[PDB]
Structures are given as C-alpha cells and as structure tokens.
C-alpha cells in the first residue's frame, strides 16, 4: 500500500478478500491514490523535524 507500482497494486489486490471481505476488486484500472505513501512521508517528516 505504501509503494505505488503495478506490482504493488497486483499484490494489494491479492489481500482484498482478507482485508475488506468478499468484494469485487477486478477493475481494469490499476490506480493507486498514494494515501498511505503521503501519510507515512508526512509523519516521517514531522518526526525527523522533531
């Protein structure tokens, strides 16, 4: 979830049944929002500054 790559998206889709549940996750779009990436990077920056 942190890293945004096609391979990372393929791995994320393999955990959808375990994490979210029995839901459809076979969309032809493989887009990642980078939300986890920005959260980790923002907290990392604040922690480094402190």
């Amino acid at each position: 979830l942190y890293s945004g790559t096609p391979e990372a998206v393929d791995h994320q889709r393999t955990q959808t049944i375990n994490t979210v549940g029995e839901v459809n996750n076979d969309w032809r779009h493989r887009l990642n929002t980078g939300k986890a990436y920005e959260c980790i990077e923002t907290v990392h920056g604040y922690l480094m500054g402190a």
Binding site: R13, E22, N25
Partner: peptide, 9 residues
C-alpha cells in the same frame, strides 16, 4: 441477488 463475485484480479 444483484451481486456476483467475479474474483478479484
């Protein structure tokens, strides 16, 4: 039901 589980891909 209106929901069918095509497998996550």
């Amino acid at each position: 039901n209106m929901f069918k589980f095509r497998g996550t891909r």
